[PDB]
Amino acid sequence: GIFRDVSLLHKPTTQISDFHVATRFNDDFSRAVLEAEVQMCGELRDYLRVTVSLWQGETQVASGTAPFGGEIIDERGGYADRVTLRLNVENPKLWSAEIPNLYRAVVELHTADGTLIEAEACDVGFREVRIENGLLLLNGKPLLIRGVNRHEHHPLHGQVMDEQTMVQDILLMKQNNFNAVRCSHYPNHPLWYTLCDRYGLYVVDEANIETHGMVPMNRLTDDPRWLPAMSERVTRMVQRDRNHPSVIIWSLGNESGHGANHDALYRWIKSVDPSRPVQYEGGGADTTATDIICPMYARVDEDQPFPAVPKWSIKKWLSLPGETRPLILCEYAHAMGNSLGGFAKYWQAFRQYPRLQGGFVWDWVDQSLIKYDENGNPWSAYGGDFGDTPNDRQFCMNGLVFADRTPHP
Amino acid sequence: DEANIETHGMVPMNRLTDDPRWLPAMSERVTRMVQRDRNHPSVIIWSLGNESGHGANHDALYRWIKSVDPSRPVQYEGGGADTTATDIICPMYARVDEDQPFPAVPKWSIKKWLSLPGETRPLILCEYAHAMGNSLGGFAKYWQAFRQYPRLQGGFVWDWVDQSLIKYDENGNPWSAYGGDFGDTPNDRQFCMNGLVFADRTPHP
Numbered sequence: 318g319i320f321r322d323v324s325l326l327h328k329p330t331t332q333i334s335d336f337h338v339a340t341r342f343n344d345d346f347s348r349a350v351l352e353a354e355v356q357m358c359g360e361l362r363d364y365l366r367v368t369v370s371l372w373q374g375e376t377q378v379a380s381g382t383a384p385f386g387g388e389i390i391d392e393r394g395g396y397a398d399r400v401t402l403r404l405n406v407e408n409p410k411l412w413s414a415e416i417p418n419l420y421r422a423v424v425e426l427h428t429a430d431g432t433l434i435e436a437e438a439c440d441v442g443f444r445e446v447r448i449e450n451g452l453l454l455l456n457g458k459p460l461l462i463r464g465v466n467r468h469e470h471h472p473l474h475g476q477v478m479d480e481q482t483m484v485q486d487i488l489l490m491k492q493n494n495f496n497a498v499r500c501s502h503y504p505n506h507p508l509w510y511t512l513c514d515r516y517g518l519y520v521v522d523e524a525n526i527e528t529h530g531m532v533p534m535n536r537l538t539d540d541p542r543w544l545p546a547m548s549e550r551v552t553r554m555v556q557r558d559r560n561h562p563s564v565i566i567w568s569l570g571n572e573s574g575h576g577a578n579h580d581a582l583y584r585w586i587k588s589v590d591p592s593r594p595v596q597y598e599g600g601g602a603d604t605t606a607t608d609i610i611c612p613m614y615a616r617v618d619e620d621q622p623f624p625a626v627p628k629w630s631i632k633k634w635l636s637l638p639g640e641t642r643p644l645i646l647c648e649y650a651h652a653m654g655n656s657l658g659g660f661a662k663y664w665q666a667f668r669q670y671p672r673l674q675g676g677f678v679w680d681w682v683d684q685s686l687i688k689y690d691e692n693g694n695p696w697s698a699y700g701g702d703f704g705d706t707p708n709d710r711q712f713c714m715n716g717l718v719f720a721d722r723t724p725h726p
Numbered sequence: 727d728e729a730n731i732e733t734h735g736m737v738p739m740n741r742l743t744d745d746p747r748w749l750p751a752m753s754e755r756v757t758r759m760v761q762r763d764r765n766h767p768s769v770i771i772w773s774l775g776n777e778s779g780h781g782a783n784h785d786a787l788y789r790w791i792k793s794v795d796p797s798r799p800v801q802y803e804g805g806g807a808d809t810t811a812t813d814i815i816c817p818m819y820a821r822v823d824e825d826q827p828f829p830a831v832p833k834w835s836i837k838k839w840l841s842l843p844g845e846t847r848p849l850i851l852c853e854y855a856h857a858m859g860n861s862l863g864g865f866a867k868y869w870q871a872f873r874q875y876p877r878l879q880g881g882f883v884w885d886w887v888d889q890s891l892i893k894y895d896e897n898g899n900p901w902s903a904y905g906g907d908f909g910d911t912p913n914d915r916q917f918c919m920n921g922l923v924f925a926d927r928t929p930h931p
């Protein structure tokens with residue numbers, strides 16, 4: 318059903334069809350340039366302009382006005398409908414989970430006289446996310462990921478998300494020493510990214526692809542005929558959430574095995590957006606479609622010996638011949654019911670081993686639905702309580718908190 | 727096969743090995759060894775020495791062996807066992823889980839050492855498990871780690887035989903002497919005996 322908002326948007330005849338925001342930094346991280354690419358749907362003409370200005374509160378730190386037209390990129394020339402505006406920012410505030418420090422950028426298409434045709438705005442965070450010497454870095458500092466996997470779930474409203482529940486979850490996360498959140502395993506609410514920008518939470522944006530039921534798991538993802546469908550699940554996500562500072566990592570999906578489509582889709586994201594590292598778990602979490610090693614529920618010392626896809630110890634995995642990539646557990650420590658036993662082992666290893674930059678806990682909130690007795694009193698329902706078969710019973714509830722949401726011990 | 731160079735008593739340990747004037751002496755201790763023992767099949771690894779810190783002479787002497795004999799990898803422990811003068815990481819008595827935090831030359835866990843950013847070389851302990859007297863406690867930990875971790879290709883135990891000398895009582899009966907039993911001072915007492923067997927040579931437990 319229609320589980321997210323429905324809206325009507327009116328645009329002008331000449332519109333800003335698209336705009337991008339990037340941030341480049343000096344090695345001292347004391348000098349930043351904001352290169353903003355702006356696309357328009359025209360209705361193109363010579364006189365109209367585009368002005369991009371950076372605002373810090375009520376103060377404008379920088380601005381840029383330029384006629385449309387791109388630099389020559391081929392023998393045919395450059396884009397006539399596009400324009401590039403790079404703004405110099407001196408000693409800027411850097412975005413992080415610890416210190417948000419958001420910037421406000423206003424992108425407006427206007428005539429040369431001048432009246433503004435359409436005005437667009439975006440929140441800009443100045444940070445850098447790059448893996449260097451096999452270490453995930455934010456602003457030149459190795460970031461230890463203390464994150465948790467989160468499903469968009471409501472016990473009363475299903476998968477419909479209100480603003481109050483998004484805030485409620487974020488506060489509880491930060492109040493329990495969480496700095497990261499992994500929207501698993503689908504693109505979340507557009508407002509969720511906004512909240513993470515201002516509050517300060519590392520976000521791993523995950524594509525809506527998961528073929529866990531197939532045999533083998535990569536039957537569709539290694540099929541060329543299914544490539545067009547998978548690409549649209551990835552490309553459209555990147556185009557929507559590439560402006561958000563809080564998002565630092567792209568994800569191809571979840572459990573979809575390893576196919577040729579993943580490698581192609583991985584290469585595409587790296588091509589369109591070199592700013593964020595791309596991770597993918599399928600194929601043993603050591604495939605060519607991931608910038609980071611992200612094993613699921615891998616253990617600290619003992620390693621599960623499986624054919625084809627072996628799960629190594631998080632300490633052993635790093636030491637494998639030809640390994641340089643860092644290890645961040647996309648999933649670990651199954652918090653189903655009474656759990657997190659030996660949870661201290663993980664975090665002793667996280668702090669000891671440099672390339673072990675933490676992971677994401679599964680899960681944050683129990684996906685339990687509310688039902689009502691004959692007497693009328695409400696009770697938490699799970700798995701096969703709705704007369705559904707075959708089902709996976711209480712396995713739906715693996716959250717660190719209840720659904721109301723009360724914290725588990 | 728290990729070269730006859732060790733400057734453990736110097737302060738710092740690389741005072742002579744980082745001295746250009748001492749380079750001619752160190753090279754002759756390395757070059758003449760290689761020329762003599764390069765034909766032997768049993769020798770598989772060259773060694774620059776032992777504890778001599780890390781100097782420019784080591785890097786030059788390392789490069790020389792690689793030049794004359796690319797058949798054998800060259801290892802050297804000094805400088806943190808992760809220097810440019812070694813083909814293999816060979817830490818001394820490094821531990822399996824806990825890592826000794828030392829300035830300049832830090833001793834990491836044998837599991838952690840492999841995972842360090844920019845590490846590709848394998849780890850073979852040139853020395854580990856000090857068999858001084860009643861020892862080899864937690865010796866099973868090393869070999870559990872050796873078999874689990876691919877890049878951990880074991881190591882060399884210290885030591886094989888107790889370096890004890892035989893002396894004689896007034897009655898004539900012989901007794902094992904160590905350290906300062908020969909009226910020598912300053913000495914390092916019973917530390918000379920770290921062998922897996924006695925000197926006769928009877929196996930230790």
Ligand SMILES: OC[C@H]1O[C@@H](SCCc2ccccc2)[C@H](O)[C@@H](O)[C@H]1O
Nearest residue numbers: 613614648651653679709712713715
């Ligand atoms: O509890 C769900 C978990 O299932 C396991 S697989 C098999 C585990 C399983 C399968 C069937 C029923 C219950 C658990 C996944 O790896 C996790 O991400 C999580 O989804």
Ligand SMILES: OC[C@H]1O[C@@H](SCCc2ccccc2)[C@H](O)[C@@H](O)[C@H]1O
Nearest residue numbers: 818819853856858884914917918920
């Ligand atoms: O027992 C000798 C050992 O001494 C230690 S250093 C310092 C250890 C030490 C120093 C002085 C007296 C006794 C032990 C060396 O690293 C080993 O190779 C071995 O030679």
Ligand code: NA
Nearest residue numbers: 667670671673
């Ligand atoms: Na770490």
Ligand code: NA
Nearest residue numbers: 712713714715
């Ligand atoms: Na589950």
Ligand code: NA
Nearest residue numbers: 872875876878
């Ligand atoms: Na091994």
Ligand code: NA
Nearest residue numbers: 917918919920
């Ligand atoms: Na000794």
